[PDB]
Each structure stands twice: as structure tokens, then as C-alpha cells.
Amino acid sequence: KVFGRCELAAAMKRHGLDNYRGYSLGNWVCAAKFESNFNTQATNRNTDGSTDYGILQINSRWWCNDGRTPGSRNLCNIPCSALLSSDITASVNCAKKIVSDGNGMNAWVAWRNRCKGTDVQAWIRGCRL
């Protein structure tokens, strides 16, 4: 499923991401835009053989099991395929654990390089929330 920008903002808000760990909703929408282009089915393979899954491109090296990242962990206790659902609950619940691990949203490279220090509120402007 490819979310609209306001559609995704409303779903993230319902799932508790607005101001979660001090990150306003615009940060989460901005990160999803540049990580996956709002596409829940996005996958990308990393150099170390791990793979990023879903609308927030969560890495199998640490966070989910795809059966093909040797020595990896599964800290969100989910199959990586669950991160590709049209239902974003699994992605949100896992992202909540990631952003709480000490490094905030710096875990997402696209957020650090393209969202951090910008007017992220522009990503939710005009949306009914």
C-alpha cells in the first residue's frame, strides 16, 4: 500500500507516534517519505546482507527475522514480512522500540540527512488530524 501523506499522518497519530519521545508527527512522516516513499512494500538489501523492510525501512540486522541474516537479532520479535503489511501497526510498534534505544531517530539515515533540522511541520500541513 502506498499511503497519501495526510493519510499516513493520521494513521501514525492514531498509533501514538505524535510527540513520541519528543518527536513531532512531521518527523515520522518526513522519515517515511524518504525511507520508503510511503510504500509499505519497500525493501532494500544492505551491503552486509541484511535487508530493510517497510515504510520505515527497519533493518533485519537487529529488529526482525527474515531467516537470511546470519547472526542477526530480532529485537522486535516479529518476522520482517509483518513490516510490509498495509496495516502499519507492526512497523509503528517496532519503530517505538528503535527510537527508545538511546539514539532517537538518528537510527534512520534518511531522517538524519533530510529531515533533521528542517521545518518538519510542513509534512503535516493541511491535513485533518
Residues at the contact surface with Na ion, assessed by CB under 5 A? 60, 65, 69, 72, 74
Least separation in angstroms between residue 64's CB and Na ion is: 6
101 in a known ligand binding site: yes
Phi, psi of 44 (to 5 degrees): -150, 135
SS3 of residue 21 by DSSP? coil
Which of the residues 7, 18, 48, 52 is marked catalytic? 52
Buried b (16+ CB within 10 A) or exposed e, 99-118: beeeebbebbebbeeebbee
- Residue closer to Cl ion, measured from CB, 14 or 68: 14
- Residue selected from 6, 10, 11, 110 as contacting Cl ion according to rule CB under 5 A: 110
Nearest distance in Å: CB 127, Cl ion: 10
The CA-atom distances, in angstroms, between 52 and each of 19, 59, 60, 94 are 24, 4, 6, 13
Residue of 7, 18, 35, 87 marked catalytic:
35
Nearer to Na ion, 24 or 65 (CB): 65
- Asked if 95 and 56 count as a contact pair (C-beta separation under 8 A), the reply is yes
7 is catalytic: no
**Which of Na ion, Cl ion, none does 93 bind, CB closer than 5 to 8 A by kind?**
none
Residue 4 vs 67, nearer CB to Na ion: 67
Nearest CA to 92 out of 2, 31, 5, 6 is that of 31
Query: Residues within the annotated binding site for substrate?
Result: 101
Residues involved in catalysis: 35, 52
